């Protein structure tokens, strides 16, 4: 969600206050005070849309990362910056191959730990070796210490 977490961080304090007032209007009659089923229903009929309940529960539980079962104001901001889409084009498999031949400096087929290590250290932002290890584990779905090609794709698919 780093894409739309930057998106909400791309918002100004004025946009956050507007969305807070929109959340205030959102939960009129809320048992949870958050965006549960009836909140989505009433704010959708506020404009005149008629969605299905299964889509509604899907949107509720998906943006619910912890398992809270409802959409909180933070998840509300996430869906607000979702429909105004920011992360364009999600550079992908072919670009990711151009990137992966590099990432795998060994020219073998897997991004070794020192290889992704140098790759991150060269990024310019705050680079820990925890970055290297965890981006390994998330790229290298095998967690073997070596990110395969497809492992690098799902490692970097959709990433702006």
């Amino acid at each position: 969600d780093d894409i739309y977490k930057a998106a909400v961080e791309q918002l100004t304090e004025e946009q956050k206050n507007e969305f807070k007032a929109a959340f205030d209007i959102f939960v009129l009659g809320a048992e949870d005070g958050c965006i549960s089923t009836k909140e989505l229903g009433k704010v959708m009929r506020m404009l005149g849309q008629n969605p299905t309940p299964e889509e509604l529960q899907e949107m509720i539980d998906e943006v619910d990362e912890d398992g809270s079962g409802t959409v909180d104001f933070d998840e509300f901001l996430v869906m607000m910056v979702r429909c105004m889409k920011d992360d364009s084009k999600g550079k992908s498999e072919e670009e990711l191959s151009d990137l992966f031949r590099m990432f795998d400096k060994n020219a073998d087929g897997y991004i070794d730990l020192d290889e992704l290590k140098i790759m991150l250290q060269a990024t310019g932002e705050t680079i820990t070796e925890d970055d290297i290890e965890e981006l390994m584990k998330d790229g290298d779905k095998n967690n073997d210490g070596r990110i395969d090609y497809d492992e690098f794709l799902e490692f970097m698919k959709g990433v702006e």
Binding site: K5, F19, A22, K85, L99, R101, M119, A122, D150, M156
Partner: protein
């Protein structure tokens, strides 16, 4: 930590792997330039006699033909490896799929429209 920092880290990984593609391409192109100056050195045309010029033309024409055929062989190899990459990626994406067909959604309608239609006078920033 802020996940905007995480976006910055990942997009910098993308740009940096792009610059690593650039450095590898720079290696390959410098190799190409040097190996091209040596693969085919600039000729010296002055002073060479008539029959000697015809012999040199025969030599350079045979070399035209041969290096043409050689780059043609490397081209056939490249075509085989293109077919290979495409078909192995197809196979994998099938084993990595049969459920991985990309879907588009248009419930993801631009937030600005409903933002306006809902809030009016206060929906000015988004």
């Amino acid at each position: 930590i802020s996940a905007s920092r995480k976006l910055q880290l990942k997009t910098l990984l993308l740009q940096i792997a792009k610059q690593e593609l650039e450095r590898e391409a720079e290696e390959r192109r410098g190799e190409k330039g040097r190996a091209l100056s040596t693969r085919c050195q600039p000729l010296e045309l002055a002073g060479l006699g008539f029959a000697e010029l015809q012999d040199l033309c025969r030599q350079l024409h045979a070399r035209v033909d041969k290096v043409d055929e050689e780059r043609y062989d490397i081209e056939a190899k490249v075509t085989k490896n293109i077919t290979e990459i495409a078909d192995l990626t197809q196979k994998i994406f099938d084993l990595r799929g049969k459920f991985k067909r990309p879907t588009l959604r248009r419930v993801r309608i631009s937030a600005d429209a409903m933002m306006q239609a809902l809030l009016g006078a206060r929906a000015k920033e988004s």
